[PDB]
Amino acid sequence: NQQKSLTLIVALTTSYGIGRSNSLPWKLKKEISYFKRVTSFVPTFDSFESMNVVLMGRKTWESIPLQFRPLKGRINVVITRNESLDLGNGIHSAKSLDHALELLYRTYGSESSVQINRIFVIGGAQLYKAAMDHPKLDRIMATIIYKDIHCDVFFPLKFRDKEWSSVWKKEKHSDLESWVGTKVPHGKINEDGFDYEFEMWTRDL
Ligand SMILES: NC(=O)c1ccc[n+]([C@@H]2O[C@H](COP(=O)([O-])OP(=O)(O)OC[C@H]3O[C@@H](n4cnc5c(N)ncnc54)[C@H](OP(=O)(O)O)[C@@H]3O)[C@@H](O)[C@H]2O)c1
Ligand SMILES: COc1cc(CN(C)c2cnc3nc(N)nc(N)c3c2)cc(OC)c1
Numbered sequence: 001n002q003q004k005s006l007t008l009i010v011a012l013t014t015s016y017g018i019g020r021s022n023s024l025p026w027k028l029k030k031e032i033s034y035f036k037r038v039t040s041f042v043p044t045f046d047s048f049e050s051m052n053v054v055l056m057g058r059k060t061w062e063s064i065p066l067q068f069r070p071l072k073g074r075i076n077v078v079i080t081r082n083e084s085l086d087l088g089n090g091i092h093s094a095k096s097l098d099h100a101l102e103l104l105y106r107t108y109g110s111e112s113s114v115q116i117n118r119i120f121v122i123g124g125a126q127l128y129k130a131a132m133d134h135p136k137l138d139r140i141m142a143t144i145i146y147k148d149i150h151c152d153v154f155f156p157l158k159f160r161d162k163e164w165s166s167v168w169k170k171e172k173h174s175d176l177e178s179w180v181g182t183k184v185p186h187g188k189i190n191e192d193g194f195d196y197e198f199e200m201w202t203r204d205l
Helices: 033-039 058-063 097-107 125-132 173-179
Strands: 005-012 018-019 050-057 073-078 093-095 115-119 138-148 189-191 192-201
Touching: 005 033, 005 125, 018 125, 033 050, 050 058, 050 097, 050 125, 058 073, 073 097, 093 097, 097 115, 097 125, 115 125, 138 173, 173 192
Parallel strands: 005 115, 005 138, 050 073, 050 115, 073 093
Antiparallel strands: 005 018, 138 192, 189 192
16 A cells, blocks of 8 residues: 555635535636646656656546546546446546555556656545545645635535644645745635635644
8 A cells, every 4th residue: 555645636615615516616727727737746857757646536537527537647546436437548446545545556666667756636525535534645735715605515624724723734835836846826816706825734644
């Protein structure tokens, strides 16, 4: 199994809402744009052999545009308990997060050209819940949507509330850009009627 640390990436409203009717209820191409630099930024040097992995629950699998997947230039994995089958041309399915890490280790690492850098959990609500309970999850890359938009799916942990202030801490913007690479919009950003912000949250293992 594991070695390295997991990163969770999410776009939620101040009330923890993350979905509605199996899609992510807003229109943000600058915020969708950010999910890509994050999810695929491997340091210039290692950039030769190293590729990032995004992990996802099947619904999200589904919820991702036909045109958009499999997410390019990242090993794509899907977590589905009842691994029925899986259409793909080199995309895995794993019974859990745990099985998924064992599948990547076994598969890569060894007699491979392909090495993994950073491992991401992109969702959904079900997979988010299991990564939050994983001893290896230490960081949350969160976009905050400052609107009380109607959702039917919620982030399972109020990580930003007082109840969790001795475990998750909001890091400095400078260390947010230092972790991604690229320069990232400081403050409040407004695109399509909404005000949002980029935060990086970290916990100690
Ligand atoms: N705002 C955001 O950033 C954001 C990001 C991602 C998702 N969301 C949204 O959330 C919605 C989908 O959320 P969701 O919670 O319903 O679905 P999900 O986790 O995306 O898909 C759920 C399925 O995936 C598998 N799965 C998830 N956690 C698992 C575990 N611990 N062990 C085994 N299988 C697990 C199971 O699949 P089987 O049924 O195949 O066993 C479970 O029914 C959509 O609106 C999606 O777009 C929002
Ligand atoms: C092109 O790549 C995609 C990926 C999705 C997957 N998805 C539900 C989604 C969307 N935005 C997100 N934003 C941030 N910060 N974090 C996430 N975890 C996230 C997840 C949907 C999509 O169609 C518009 C395009």
